[PDB]
Amino acid sequence: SERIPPQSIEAEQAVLGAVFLDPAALVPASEILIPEDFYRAAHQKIFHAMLRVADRGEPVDLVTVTAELAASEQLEEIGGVSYLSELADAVPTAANVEYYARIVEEKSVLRRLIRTATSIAQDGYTREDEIDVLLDEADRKIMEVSQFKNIKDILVQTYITGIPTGFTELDRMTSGFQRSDLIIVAARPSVGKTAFALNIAQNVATKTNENVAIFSLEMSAQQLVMRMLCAEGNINAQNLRTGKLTPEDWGKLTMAMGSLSNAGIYIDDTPSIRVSDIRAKCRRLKQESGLGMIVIDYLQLIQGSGRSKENRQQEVSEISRSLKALARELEVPVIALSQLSRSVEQRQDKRPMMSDIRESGSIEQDADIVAFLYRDDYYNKDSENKNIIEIIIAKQRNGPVGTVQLAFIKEYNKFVNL
Amino acid sequence: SERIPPQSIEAEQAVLGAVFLDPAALVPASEILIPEDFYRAAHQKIFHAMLRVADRGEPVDLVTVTAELAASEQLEEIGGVSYLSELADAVPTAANVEYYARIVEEKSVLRRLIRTATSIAQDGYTREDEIDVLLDEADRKIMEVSQ
Amino acid sequence: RIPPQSIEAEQAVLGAVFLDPAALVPASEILIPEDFYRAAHQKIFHAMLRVADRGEPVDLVTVTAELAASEQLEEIGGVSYLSELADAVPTAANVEYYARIVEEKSVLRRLIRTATSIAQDGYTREDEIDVLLDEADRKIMEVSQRKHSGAFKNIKDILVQTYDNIEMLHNRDGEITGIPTGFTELDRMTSGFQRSDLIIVAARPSVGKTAFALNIAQNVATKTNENVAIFSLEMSAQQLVMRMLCAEGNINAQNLRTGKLTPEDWGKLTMAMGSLSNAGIYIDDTPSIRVSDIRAKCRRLKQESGLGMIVIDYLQLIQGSGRSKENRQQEVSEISRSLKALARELEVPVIALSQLSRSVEQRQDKRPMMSDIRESGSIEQDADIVAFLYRDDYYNKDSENKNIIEIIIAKQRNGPVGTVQLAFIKEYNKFVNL
Amino acid sequence: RIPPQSIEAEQAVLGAVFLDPAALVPASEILIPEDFYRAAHQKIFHAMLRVADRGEPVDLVTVTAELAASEQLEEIGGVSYLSELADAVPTAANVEYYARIVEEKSVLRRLIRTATSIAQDGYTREDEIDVLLDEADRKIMEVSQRKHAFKNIKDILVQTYDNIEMLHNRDGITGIPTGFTELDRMTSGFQRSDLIIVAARPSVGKTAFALNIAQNVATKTNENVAIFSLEMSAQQLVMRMLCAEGNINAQNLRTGKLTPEDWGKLTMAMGSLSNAGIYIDDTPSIRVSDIRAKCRRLKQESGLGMIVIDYLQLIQGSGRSKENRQQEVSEISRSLKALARELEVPVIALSQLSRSVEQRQDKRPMMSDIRESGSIEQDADIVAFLYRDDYYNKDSENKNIIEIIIAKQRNGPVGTVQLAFIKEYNKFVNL
Amino acid sequence: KCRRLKQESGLGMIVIDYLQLIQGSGRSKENRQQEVSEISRSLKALARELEVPVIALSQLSRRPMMSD
DNA sequence: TTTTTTTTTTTTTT
Numbered sequence A: 001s002e003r004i005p006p007q008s009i010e011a012e013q014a015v016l017g018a019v020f021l022d023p024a025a026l027v028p029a030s031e032i033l034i035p036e037d038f039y040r041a042a043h044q045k046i047f048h049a050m051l052r053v054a055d056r057g058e059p060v061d062l063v064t065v066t067a068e069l070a071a072s073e074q075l076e077e078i079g080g081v082s083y084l085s086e087l088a089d090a091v092p093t094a095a096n097v098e099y100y101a102r103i104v105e106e107k108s109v110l111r112r113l114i115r116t117a118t119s120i121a122q123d124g125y126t127r128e129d130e131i132d133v134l135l136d137e138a139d140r141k142i143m144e145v146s147q148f149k150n151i152k153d154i155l156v157q158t159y160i161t162g163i164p165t166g167f168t169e170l171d172r173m174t175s176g177f178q179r180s181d182l183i184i185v186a187a188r189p190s191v192g193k194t195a196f197a198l199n200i201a202q203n204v205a206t207k208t209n210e211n212v213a214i215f216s217l218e219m220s221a222q223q224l225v226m227r228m229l230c231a232e233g234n235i236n237a238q239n240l241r242t243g244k245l246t247p248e249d250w251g252k253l254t255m256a257m258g259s260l261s262n263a264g265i266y267i268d269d270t271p272s273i274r275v276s277d278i279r280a281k282c283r284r285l286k287q288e289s290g291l292g293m294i295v296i297d298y299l300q301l302i303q304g305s306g307r308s309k310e311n312r313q314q315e316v317s318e319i320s321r322s323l324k325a326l327a328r329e330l331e332v333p334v335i336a337l338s339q340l341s342r343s344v345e346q347r348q349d350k351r352p353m354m355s356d357i358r359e360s361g362s363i364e365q366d367a368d369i370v371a372f373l374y375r376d377d378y379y380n381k382d383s384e385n386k387n388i389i390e391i392i393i394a395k396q397r398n399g400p401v402g403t404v405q406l407a408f409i410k411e412y413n414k415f416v417n418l
Numbered sequence B: 001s002e003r004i005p006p007q008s009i010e011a012e013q014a015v016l017g018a019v020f021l022d023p024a025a026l027v028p029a030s031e032i033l034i035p036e037d038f039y040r041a042a043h044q045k046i047f048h049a050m051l052r053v054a055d056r057g058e059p060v061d062l063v064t065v066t067a068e069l070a071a072s073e074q075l076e077e078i079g080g081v082s083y084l085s086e087l088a089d090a091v092p093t094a095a096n097v098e099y100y101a102r103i104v105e106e107k108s109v110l111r112r113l114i115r116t117a118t119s120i121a122q123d124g125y126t127r128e129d130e131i132d133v134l135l136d137e138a139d140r141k142i143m144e145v146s147q
Numbered sequence C: 001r002i003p004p005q006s007i008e009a010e011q012a013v014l015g016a017v018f019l020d021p022a023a024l025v026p027a028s029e030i031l032i033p034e035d036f037y038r039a040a041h042q043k044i045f046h047a048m049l050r051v052a053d054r055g056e057p058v059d060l061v062t063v064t065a066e067l068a069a070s071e072q073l074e075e076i077g078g079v080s081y082l083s084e085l086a087d088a089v090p091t092a093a094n095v096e097y098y099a100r101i102v103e104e105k106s107v108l109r110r111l112i113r114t115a116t117s118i119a120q121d122g123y124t125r126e127d128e129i130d131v132l133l134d135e136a137d138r139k140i141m142e143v144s145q146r147k148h149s150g151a152f153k154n155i156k157d158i159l160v161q162t163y164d165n166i167e168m169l170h171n172r173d174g175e176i177t178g179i180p181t182g183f184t185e186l187d188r189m190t191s192g193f194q195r196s197d198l199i200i201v202a203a204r205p206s207v208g209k210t211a212f213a214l215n216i217a218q219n220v221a222t223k224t225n226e227n228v229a230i231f232s233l234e235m236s237a238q239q240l241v242m243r244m245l246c247a248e249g250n251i252n253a254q255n256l257r258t259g260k261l262t263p264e265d266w267g268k269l270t271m272a273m274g275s276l277s278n279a280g281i282y283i284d285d286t287p288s289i290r291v292s293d294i295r296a297k298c299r300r301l302k303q304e305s306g307l308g309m310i311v312i313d314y315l316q317l318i319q320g321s322g323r324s325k326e327n328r329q330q331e332v333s334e335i336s337r338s339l340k341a342l343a344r345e346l347e348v349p350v351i352a353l354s355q356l357s358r359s360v361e362q363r364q365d366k367r368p369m370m371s372d373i374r375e376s377g378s379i380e381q382d383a384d385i386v387a388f389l390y391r392d393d394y395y396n397k398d399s400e401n402k403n404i405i406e407i408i409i410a411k412q413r414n415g416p417v418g419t420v421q422l423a424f425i426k427e428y429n430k431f432v433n434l
Numbered sequence D: 001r002i003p004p005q006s007i008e009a010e011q012a013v014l015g016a017v018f019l020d021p022a023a024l025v026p027a028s029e030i031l032i033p034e035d036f037y038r039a040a041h042q043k044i045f046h047a048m049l050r051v052a053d054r055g056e057p058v059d060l061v062t063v064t065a066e067l068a069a070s071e072q073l074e075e076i077g078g079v080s081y082l083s084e085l086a087d088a089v090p091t092a093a094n095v096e097y098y099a100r101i102v103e104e105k106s107v108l109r110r111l112i113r114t115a116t117s118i119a120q121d122g123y124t125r126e127d128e129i130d131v132l133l134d135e136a137d138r139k140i141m142e143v144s145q146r147k148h149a150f151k152n153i154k155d156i157l158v159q160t161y162d163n164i165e166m167l168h169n170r171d172g173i174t175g176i177p178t179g180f181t182e183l184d185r186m187t188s189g190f191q192r193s194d195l196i197i198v199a200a201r202p203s204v205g206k207t208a209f210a211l212n213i214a215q216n217v218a219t220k221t222n223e224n225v226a227i228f229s230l231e232m233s234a235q236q237l238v239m240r241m242l243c244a245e246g247n248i249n250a251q252n253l254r255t256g257k258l259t260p261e262d263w264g265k266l267t268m269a270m271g272s273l274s275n276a277g278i279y280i281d282d283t284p285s286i287r288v289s290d291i292r293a294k295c296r297r298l299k300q301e302s303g304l305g306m307i308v309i310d311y312l313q314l315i316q317g318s319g320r321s322k323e324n325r326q327q328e329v330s331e332i333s334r335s336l337k338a339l340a341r342e343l344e345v346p347v348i349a350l351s352q353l354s355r356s357v358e359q360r361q362d363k364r365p366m367m368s369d370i371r372e373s374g375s376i377e378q379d380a381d382i383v384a385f386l387y388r389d390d391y392y393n394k395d396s397e398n399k400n401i402i403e404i405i406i407a408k409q410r411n412g413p414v415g416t417v418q419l420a421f422i423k424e425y426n427k428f429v430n431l
Numbered sequence E: 001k002c003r004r005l006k007q008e009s010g011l012g013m014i015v016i017d018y019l020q021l022i023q024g025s026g027r028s029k030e031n032r033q034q035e036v037s038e039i040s041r042s043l044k045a046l047a048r049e050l051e052v053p054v055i056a057l058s059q060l061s062r063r064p065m066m067s068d
Numbered sequence F: 001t002t003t004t005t006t007t008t009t010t011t012t013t014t
């Protein structure tokens, strides 16, 4: 019934706030937004002023901005200096404006869509005159809700936002591991899925100060920790397995244990959980300690909410939705490991494409970002350049698509930079 | 705007009428239209029956059509034989069915457009979850409407 | 509830008899009086046959005379009911079909009636099981055992149609029986381009497929009086007409698309346009059609103007009927069938251009064989006639005797197989006799 | 309106089991629990079998133990009802008879039920008449252990001897004779119930050969032959036969450009072909069921001898959805053999061949080459390939010669036979 | 992308760095010959729709002839 | 909707 034009004027305030706090934060903000993207009339005017002052450039602080707003009839229209003062105290830091700007922008696009859709329907009843050209306008008007490098742009001239993974090249392409993202890491069996996830978890939990929850549905907590120890200290896994450790290995282990203690990584190895359970547990850990990342050791191993044992494709379709929504609710990146269907092993080229994600196509469709792992040496016994592993970033609606290379020293359960 | 979906019932009846009059006029008619293009539930069923009988082919006259409509539960649903009789008389001759068919068709497309645009707007307020795939659906749903 | 019946249809039959009345012959071949549901129609249709046995013959008078001759005229409604029957049948030339409805409904209730009496007997004769099951078996066949109607063409009847058809032929001047292409040597070998034939013209890319098809279309449309439909899925209508103009007037194609025309070229163009106007060639350049669409369009053009030929610019470009994106070989297998079936239904030659696989270029002898037809072998099979185009000069840059082009007639179930030779002056988009 | 049943006999069966209980063996060979009419007996006889599968075995104790093990002991009357069942029959010595009563009653109400549902469907599905009949036919046969007793060899040997006897008292081709001597020697007909596959590349001579056979059968013998042409019209077929019957050049015939002696030839070609009795159905799409129906009827009133089908892969499938096409034709293949078997008449199915063969050195076909499904090789009683050297060689020495390669037959001998195929006359001739 | 560039600036030519590098529409990674058979048609169709020459670069198997 | 195993017609893989 009551239809409220979509907006988040909390997030709006968070953007303007960050600018008064930083103000190098105006660069990302304006790359992402124009003044009109803001819903509240007042913010429109403020963010306009902010850019107006940057074009001088003054630069942009609480003073100069009010100076610019008074320079036009506008300072009284937007609330007082007292409103501009509130905007400042909105956020603790001008950390991650990029995040909130992208919310404001996404909402803007939504109502632009709604508006052009309603005006198409509107015109459906009126211009009953020229059917084929009405269909062209509809085509064209729906594309224009979306907003090719020129030769000149390409002449800038010859000759992390972001929870950081610790893999430079991936981080450059991605910049974290962003709050609220669903990150899918899929690859054939025994290729390196878990290894890669665990490596990321360590570098986050040890290098940063954030807590990470890992749900392992296949491996025990014990086996997980043993993988991390080997990777932290470069101890050969076979040796560690057996207890057959060299005198310096003991040193390496003593160390590895040290650093992993203050690491703060919470592991849940219950073999059958529903997403609701996962949510519950994380909600509580965030409550009392704060959460940074959630890792899930594997999406199709999670189990369904009651809908009866439904068309299994729908069952996972649903798990997929739930996870994204959990990532959204807790404002935290969620890395979900996925399997792939065997169809890749038919191809003469064994690099996965999005279609290959096992069991339900909705996973491609819910993910904020899809990463495949490919290893030449998985297939070739003799393969030249062994330890190399491609991290194919097949999808991301932050930005760039592409492949990144790392080394996967298997004896050490370890991924390394090159 | 109205809330009056685009249609042209002068024209639907004119098509069905021409078929009972000719009935070689069913050939142009069906090239141009499928039963669903008709707005009135009743005409849908009738034009379907007409094609159903042509596939035998009987062929298509006021008798065989009512025989086919009664063969399903439908003869009473579409008005009587008395409505089929009216359809016959809602026409001089069946020259240029192609013309009126293309009107019926064009109106069909209009409401199909209106219907998909409203459902896009509808979905705009609900599925605030995805943005990029919501824009994909809109892209894709509007192409599917040029057929 | 209500037993299956059609009075709309019963009346239509009786009506047609009072209208024709030669319509009583099909009617009675298909029906006996008992097949009618309404007690009254039973009696009327009986009277009709009763009067036919004299024979009177059957009209509104004699019938009422016969019905009054028994106690029956008042029982069936009045003369006023017989009068209504007259007025209540749309077109009397298809009594066959209304009769078949009345007949089909008759069979239905006969089935219902024997099925209910089986169930009936199930409770009663609980005595001898095996002979009860045999009777059920046997009683249900005796429904299927429906009399007259049952398509097997008796040979006595066909032979007559053949003699009479031969006869007709024998009084035509003669030579070509079909639609003449205007290429003498090909026409001698083929004699048209026969109604209902599927003609496949296949050859490697840029060899001359379309060129050859268009040339045939012109010579048919301008030399004869027949209409020809051309479906072009690759080229536009305007490119097609531009090819015909060049060929009709011997205007150099490069000159023509530049507008760089000599003073006599204009003359040639003025003529070309003149004759191509009264030509009557209907062009459909929609780049994706289903065969169903083609059928539909042709059916209508034949309706109001009459059709002679259908040309299709190429078969593997046509698109499938829904069966999902099936084993592609099957998809075209089906298109193939549909085309032959279309030529059959419209009683008109259908010339389908086809591509060839890379097979032939691998061979030493680059001349195509049937196997080479691209994408599905069913095309060789379905075709009435398969023509390949081979140009030596297509492969040899230097080739001795250039403009010559073989028309290899690799298949025909009319008659003779063989090769024919023509010249293909490419500068003029033109095929010529030798 | 009271369902056929025989409770007395039901009790007698259950009784005998509690009495014997080796009587359960015959009982279960004859009955399943559902055959019993009384809800209670159903459950009891189920329990009996359930306990036998352990096996306990089956007595008044173990049975009540099993019935109490489910919620059922109170539902079937008490232990007191099971006790009555024991006392109901004298001895166990003839469960077989009571079982057969229960069974016969079961069949009765199964019949009544399918009959009522046929009448039921009569008012509803007024849509398709011919496929509604077939279902009735088929639904009423399914009312038996109709798929089910062994045939003893002593008995077969006799009917075999007696057959050999009669064969001898003939008249030795066994056999509908094709009129091609060398083929007939190898084959002896064209036997009742055989499926004969004639396959060859396009425009090689498939139809021509089949038609020639049909004539010589229909005119030389007195038997009726049905031809289903799915590709050519009835007219085109008759025109081929006229040319072959009278040696009239086909080109002349289809122009009307006939010599004075040609009309003579035509006049008596027509003459002999009239009393020929060949029934032609040229409907371009039929299912095998349709073919079956039409033949069944023609045999009914005139008797049938041969069925010719202008061509197996052109036939269309029974509903199973547009299935793996190989299975679709796999099925048509089965149906055809089963039709030949049911009508006790040779069925000649023409077949196409895959392009496989065009790839070879030796262009003589092998069984594998049959187009679209390998089940055809397997189902066929006999597989005949046509090969023509002159089909591939433009210049070929000895033109009109054509091999009839008999690649398969489970009557007997395999081998090649030679004929001449005078194409100008649509005619195959002996050598 | 081209539809949009033509929309606001007008297009004249499209050049593509190479045809067999383009990737398939979902049909499962089909008989690869069909996959590019498809790309081929799509391209022609695109050239036709935008009324603009499309230059597609192509590789050759194994003076070339068309078969290659 | 998807994942699996089978048979059998096509094209194109240096």
Ligand SMILES: Nc1nc2c(ncn2[C@@H]2O[C@H](COP(=O)(O)OP(=O)(O)O)[C@@H](O)[C@H]2O)c(=O)[nH]1
Pocket (backbone or CB within 6 Å): A187, A188, A189, A190, A191, A192, A193, A194, A195, A196, A236, A237, A238, A410, A411, A412
């Ligand atoms: N050489 C060596 N390789 C190992 C050792 N331990 C594990 N690996 C390899 O490292 C990989 C880790 O398993 P993983 O890929 O995470 O399982 P996933 O979830 O299917 O991807 C496997 O491919 C193992 O073969 C070891 O002790 N020595």
Ligand SMILES: Nc1nc2c(ncn2[C@@H]2O[C@H](COP(=O)(O)OP(=O)(O)O)[C@@H](O)[C@H]2O)c(=O)[nH]1
Pocket (backbone or CB within 6 Å): C203, C204, C205, C206, C207, C208, C209, C210, C211, C212, C252, C253, C254, C426, C427, C428, C429
């Ligand atoms: N000299 C000359 N030759 C041409 C001209 N236009 C076309 N041709 C040749 O004429 C033929 C016509 O195309 P076509 O063979 O019908 O295409 P197809 O459908 O693949 O058979 C081509 O093979 C051309 O290379 C022209 O303007 N001048």
Ligand SMILES: Nc1nc2c(ncn2[C@@H]2O[C@H](COP(=O)(O)OP(=O)(O)O)[C@@H](O)[C@H]2O)c(=O)[nH]1
Pocket (backbone or CB within 6 Å): C411, C412, C413, C414, C415, C416, C417, D200, D201, D202, D203, D204, D205, D206, D207, D208, D209, D249, D250, D251, D423, D424, D426
């Ligand atoms: N010379 C000549 N050959 C003919 C004539 N009529 C038919 N043929 C040939 O006879 C053969 C008929 O083969 P057919 O059985 O219809 O092909 P199939 O059904 O696929 O085996 C073809 O090879 C034709 O070329 C004719 O009048 N003259």
Ligand code: ALF
Pocket (backbone or CB within 6 Å): A188, A189, A190, A191, A193, A218, A298
């Ligand atoms: F081998 Al895994 F997930 F444990 F693919």
Ligand code: ALF
Pocket (backbone or CB within 6 Å): C204, C205, C206, C207, C209, C210, C234, C355
């Ligand atoms: F030009 Al083409 F087949 F090569 F039509």
Ligand code: ALF
Pocket (backbone or CB within 6 Å): C380, C381, C382, C413, D201, D202, D203, D206, D207, D231, D311, D352
């Ligand atoms: F071409 Al055919 F049977 F006449 F395959």
Ligand SMILES: [Ca+2]
Pocket (backbone or CB within 6 Å): A193, A194, A218, A297
């Ligand atoms: Ca794992």
Ligand SMILES: [Ca+2]
Pocket (backbone or CB within 6 Å): A317, A321, A362
């Ligand atoms: Ca979803």
Ligand SMILES: [Ca+2]
Pocket (backbone or CB within 6 Å): A355, A356
């Ligand atoms: Ca998939």
Ligand SMILES: [Ca+2]
Pocket (backbone or CB within 6 Å): A368, A397
């Ligand atoms: Ca997002």
Ligand SMILES: [Ca+2]
Pocket (backbone or CB within 6 Å): C209, C210, C234, C313
């Ligand atoms: Ca062409």
Ligand SMILES: [Ca+2]
Pocket (backbone or CB within 6 Å): D206, D207, D231, D310
């Ligand atoms: Ca044939």
Ligand SMILES: [Ca+2]
Pocket (backbone or CB within 6 Å): D222, D275, D276, D277
């Ligand atoms: Ca006779």
